[PDB]
Ligand binder design. Structure first.
Ligand SMILES: [Zn+2]
Ligand SMILES: [Zn+2]
Ligand SMILES: [Zn+2]
Lengths: 172, 119, 192, 123, 107, 93
RNA sequence: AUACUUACCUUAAGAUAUCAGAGGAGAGUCCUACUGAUCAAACAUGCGCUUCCAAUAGUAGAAGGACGUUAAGCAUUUAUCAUUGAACUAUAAUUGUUCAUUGAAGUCAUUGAUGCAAACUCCUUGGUCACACACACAUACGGCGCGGAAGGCGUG
RNA sequence: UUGGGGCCCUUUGUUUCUUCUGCCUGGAGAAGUUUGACACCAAAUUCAAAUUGGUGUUAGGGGAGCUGGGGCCUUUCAAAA
RNA sequence: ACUUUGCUCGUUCCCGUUAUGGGAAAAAUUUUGGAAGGUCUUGGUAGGAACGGGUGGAUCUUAUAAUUUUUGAUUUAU
RNA sequence: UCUAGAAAGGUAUGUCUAAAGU
């Protein structure tokens, strides 16, 4: 038999046609994505500090740092540090998620634009994007959204949009 | 008969395993796996110089014998001395048995004797 | 089997007159119907006549250049015709089951009460009550919405997209039974 | 380092083995799995080799110094046809007593997990 | 006899497996090594690494790995026109059988 | 039969960038589409290093399983569930 | 959560330490909360057993790295062939030599690669424990403090 | 209960067993400790709110009771000289 | 070896007597095994015992010495 | 000649039906 360690559900006689259909099951994909998000979150969130090996301080060090002065230490209440840690975690996540993307917005009318920046007509990763689009065997998945697709073809030329300013542009 | 069940009975005996490369391993034998995966405790790996002036040793086995890491460096010949090597089974060419063992009690196959007697 | 040379031995040994009951002539023509439905849920069991590859490639040679044996065609047509007429009976049973749902008693009395409730501005009131009765018939449809796949006889639906239909139409059942219908259409055109 | 005399490869999990292979290469990495075919899974292995040029320095006649090519490979699995010997190098990060504490704690957590899963699916 | 040779080996049962092994040793190609184990004649084995050995056979196996005794290894080596003949005497020895080429039986 | 932790780990890395060196010396590195039970892998959009160094590019490749020397999966599969020693499977069917 | 539709699939066999004795069940098998010995595992518990555990009476030190810098360091060594033209040493598929056409394929690197040696910087790891600032030793050295890590050996 | 001295506070989210309150002129107060409690990740319903699915945390030190084992001693009993 | 009769040496005690015998303990003591208790030192302290599995995982045996790992094309050699 | 009763599940999939306010 087979046992999906992430899923926690058994299965009957392990045939590759059953197993491969399980491994692209939507519910298995949700369980696996939760598992790996939580494990990466646990290894980020785990502050393991070095063990402390305290040596006995000497005399002249003790005179110098007993004759410097004493500094005040600041500390906060419980709700303050909880609110601050929520702020710090969302700021680290938006730095990890964002990316500068102005070279894509800035060449938006250029002549060979659809052959490089479209990301579906690229010659290196061109076939992969079309290949991994997914079946969408759900009618209501396509029936949810009612906007336009805006598929820019690879066959586009320099002639269309001859004057870029007159078609209404946006300032950066 | 399967003759690895003879090798399982030799425990804590010094052997001198010839490998397929040419390097020989000399140490206290231990639990031998059923596919002849020998585990040796206190080994003295060595690689014999060919004892002709013009000839070459094995190059692959020489680099392997250094990259065990425990090669005692200042010595002249390729001798590495380490503890606990775990030799994979399909690489042992021949095993030089100790001399003192009594073959006439070791080579009695218990399972063959049982299968001849019970049938 | 377990070691791959065992399975390879199995294949070469089944590779190594040509008449009588020993050889399934229906497989020999091609696509034995007890072979196309081995593992599925419409499984007939095992093909009674044995199947063998040396005989099959000898038949490939014979119908390549030598001759054709029409007794094989009439035997295959008999087995094909009895299976196709049996599954025509079964799709008749399936649409009978849709009818028997459609002429259910309490649903007919409910639609009869709503159709007595259907009884200028009289036409506007009648059309509003008849659109309510049309939505009652469509509520009975929203309980089911079943059409019948005309080849295999299994149920289908139209609210579902083309892609889950494409998931159905590349089946073992539906491809096997399409192959049966196509050899039946070919032999009934050719014999007539 | 000293390894126990009766310690097969099933017992040396999370040690830092030094797996020799058929080519003179050596994969110094932390072991974490193995198999019937003896094809390990090394965690942080560093595939070394002695080059064709410096191999004359190992030829039999201060000390000798060899410059090897450390090439970092993260979480390899090996193919067991290639392996030639395994030698232990370093002990684990944890002790034995600490691994005992952590193993009892993991088994306790698994039994609580299955208890909650069973009593949730009965509800 | 015929019933165990003709069938594939996965259709035999356990008593027929052991009977087949006894048949393969007693009436077969390894009957050479078995006759030399009983009759105490020295064998000459040509290993795959161009070492020839000469010994007596205490036991053998289905893989042709064998426990020898009074082993006399004989190999030749050369680098160019310089060439010597070498000899090594080993008392008791286990030969892993995947290296053998031709077991011979001395007249 | 049973596969054990390495071949099952290789099946856990279907979809991600792996880097494998054959026994002839070559090094292929791409997205791993379908591995199999005998470590027989496919690789899509690969960057193929020949043994003397000449790197080329090729769309898909199917190595024989027997020629692989190692396979370098991503780092996060250290935390894969099959490495958990004390596991509590619920119930057989 | 419930329900229906459709797809895919339905399990290699045997065993759980050995030897030996005693007893029994219609020559062999099977069994004994039967009996001895051997092996193995766990748990305890021990050895004058072996190895290792970082200055403050000071600004140090050990083991391991650097996929760190000086650094284009110092010394060497490489950078495609053909068909022809003009000349050309020349057994070759005009090879050698300068210039060009045409033709095969053609990882990048030449601040590279290979060899050699040093200096500086930065990481990770631990008992930074307790007592003491002392005159020991041929059977060479009270190994006669509390622990911790790893191995050896013995018993229950 | 108070006062003084030494050492540590990197315990960096100022004791890290959790929640709430709280602090460097201080080292504190309450509540809780496994058919549970708590922290967090994901998603769709168009803020939060809610449910469903996952990953974790639930600690360290000392003391009375009962108990497994070892060493020494005393008393008794059976056996060997 | 049992058995009896007297002599001699002798562990301890008594008696005829401190020559030496008679009687008793067949002893004082040492070792091994068991119970009780003293004290020291180390560990555990919420789950454990019996039974049932068309129960999971390990290990072994056999298919398995025939192209995918373990019964050889990596000592570069003619 | 020695008495034939085939499983009953698992995962994947869409659709229906439904449960929510401020
Ligand atoms: Zn799953
Ligand atoms: Zn047929
Ligand atoms: Zn259909």
């Amino acid at each position: 038999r087979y046992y999906c360690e992430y899923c926690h559900s058994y299965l009957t006689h392990d045939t590759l046609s059953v197993r491969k259909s399980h491994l692209v099951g939507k519910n298995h994909l949700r369980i696996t994505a939760d598992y790996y998000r939580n494990k990466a979150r646990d290894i980020i969130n785990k502050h393991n500090h070095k063990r402390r090996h305290i040596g006995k301080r000497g005399r002249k060090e003790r005179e110098n740092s007993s004759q410097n002065e004493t500094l005040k230490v600041t500390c906060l209440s419980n709700k303050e540090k909880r609110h601050i840690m929520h702020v710090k975690k969302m700021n680290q996540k938006e730095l990890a998620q964002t990316s500068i993307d102005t070279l894509k917005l800035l060449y938006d009318g250029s002549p060979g634009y659809s052959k490089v920046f479209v990301d579906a007509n690229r010659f290196d990763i061109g076939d992969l994007v079309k290949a991994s689009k997914l079946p969408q065997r759900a009618n209501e998945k396509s029936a949810h959204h009612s906007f336009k697709q805006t598929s820019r073809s690879r066959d586009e030329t320099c002639e269309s949009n001859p004057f870029p300013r007159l078609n209404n542009p946006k300032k950066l | 008969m399967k003759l690895v069940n003879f090798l399982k009975k030799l425990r804590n005996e010094q052997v001198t395993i010839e490998l397929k490369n040419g390097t020989t391993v000399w140490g206290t034998l231990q639990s031998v796996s059923p596919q002849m995966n020998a585990i040796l405790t206190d080994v003295k790996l060595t690689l014999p110089q060919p004892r002709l002036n013009k000839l070459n040793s094995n190059g692959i086995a020489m680099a392997s014998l250094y990259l065990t890491g425990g090669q005692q460096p200042t010595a002249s010949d390729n001798i590495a001395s380490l503890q606990y090597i775990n030799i994979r089974g399909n690489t042992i060419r021949q095993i030089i048995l100790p001399d003192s063992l009594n073959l006439d009690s070791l080579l009695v196959d218990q399972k063959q004797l049982n299968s001849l007697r019970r049938s | 089997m377990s070691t791959p040379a065992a399975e390879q031995r199995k294949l070469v040994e089944q590779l190594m007159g040509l008449h009588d009951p020993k050889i399934c002539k229906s497989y020999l023509v091609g696509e034995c119907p007890y072979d196309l439905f081995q593992g599925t849920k419409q499984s007939l069991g095992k093909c009674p006549q044995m199947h063998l590859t040396k005989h099959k490639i000898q038949y490939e040679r014979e119908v390549k250049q030598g001759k054709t044996f029409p007794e094989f065609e009439r035997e295959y047509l008999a087995i094909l015709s009895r299976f196709v007429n049996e599954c025509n009976g079964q799709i008749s049973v399936a649409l009978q089951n849709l009818k028997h749902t459609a002429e259910e008693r309490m649903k007919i009395q409910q639609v009869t009460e709503e159709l007595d409730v259907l009884d200028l501005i009289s036409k506007r009131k009648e059309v509003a009550k008849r659109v309510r009765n049309i939505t009652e018939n469509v509520g009975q449809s929203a309980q089911q919405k079943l059409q019948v796949c005309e080849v295999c006889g299994a149920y289908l639906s139209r609210l579902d997209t083309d892609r889950r239909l494409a998931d159905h139409f590349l089946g073992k059942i539906h491809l096997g039974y399409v192959k049966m219908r196509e050899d039946y259409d070919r032999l009934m055109k050719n014999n007539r | 380092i000293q390894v126990a005399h009766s310690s097969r490869l099933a017992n040396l999990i999370d040690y830092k083995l030094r797996v020799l292979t058929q080519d003179g290469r050596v994969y110094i990495g932390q072991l974490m799995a193995f198999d019937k075919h003896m094809n390990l899974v090394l965690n942080e292995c560093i595939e070394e080799r002695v080059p064709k040029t410096q191999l004359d320095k190992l030829r039999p006649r201060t000390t000798l110094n060899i410059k090897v090519e450390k090439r970092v490979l993260g979480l390899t699995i090996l193919r067991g046809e290639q392996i030639l010997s395994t030698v232990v190098e370093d002990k684990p990060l944890l002790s034995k007593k600490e691994r005992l504490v952590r193993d009892k704690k993991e088994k306790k957590q698994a039994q609580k997990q299955t208890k909650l899963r069973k009593e949730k699916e009965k509800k | 006899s015929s019933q165990i040779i003709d069938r594939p080996k996965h259709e035999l049962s356990r008593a027929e497996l052991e009977e087949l092994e006894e048949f393969e040793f007693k009436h077969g190609p390894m009957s050479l090594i078995n006759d030399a184990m009983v009759t105490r004649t020295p064998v000459i084995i040509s290993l795959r690494n161009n070492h020839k050995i000469i010994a007596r056979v205490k036991a053998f196996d289905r893989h042709c790995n064998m426990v020898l005794e009074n082993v006399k290894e004989l190999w030749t080596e050369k680098k160019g026109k310089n060439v010597i003949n070498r000899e090594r005497f080993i008392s008791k020895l286990f030969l892993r059988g995947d290296s053998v080429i031709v077991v011979l039986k001395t007249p | 039969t049973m596969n054990g932790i390495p071949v099952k780990l290789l099946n856990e890395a279907q979809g991600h960038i792996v880097s494998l060196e054959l026994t002839t010396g070559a090094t292929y590195r791409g997205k791993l589409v379908e591995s199999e039970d005998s470590m027989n892998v496919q690789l899509r959009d690969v960057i193929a290093t020949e043994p003397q160094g000449a790197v080329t590019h090729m769309d898909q490749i199917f190595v024989r399983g027997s020629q692989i020397k190692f396979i370098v999966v991503p780092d996060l599969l250290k935390n894969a569930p099959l490495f958990k020693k004390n596991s509590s499977r619920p119930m057989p069917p």
